[PDB]
Design a binder for these strands. Structure first.
Length: 69
RNA sequence: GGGUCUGUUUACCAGGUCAGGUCCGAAAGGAAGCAGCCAAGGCAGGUCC
């Protein structure tokens, strides 16, 4: 389960916006998204880094469910 | 090494177009710009000077 699968599910518009700024590698293996990329992703989507942090957290929570849900 | 072809590779670090999203503007309209793709560079192989 990854961002691709999370993407496949207004607050919803921005979320997409954040994911539409990542590379394929980032979507498939989210844990590689650190300081420099979050920043690339936030500016690239007109969002704040903390916006990206929340997005990744909501994704994390779900990724946890997949295997225990 | 240079021309060229083929495969492959490359988040941001001043290429093109820039979906989506964003910024400025009362509006008319402006501007920046991620991913993609393309270009380009890297690694090889063919071929040629």
């Amino acid at each position: 389960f990854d961002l691709n699968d999370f993407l496949e599910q207004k607050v919803l518009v921005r979320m997409e916006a954040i994911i539409n700024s990542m590379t394929m590698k980032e979507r498939a293996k989210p844990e590689i998204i650190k300081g420099s990329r979050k920043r690339r992703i936030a500016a690239g989507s007109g969002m704040q880094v903390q916006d990206v942090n929340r997005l990744l957290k909501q994704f994390d929570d779900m990724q946890r469910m997949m295997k225990k849900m």
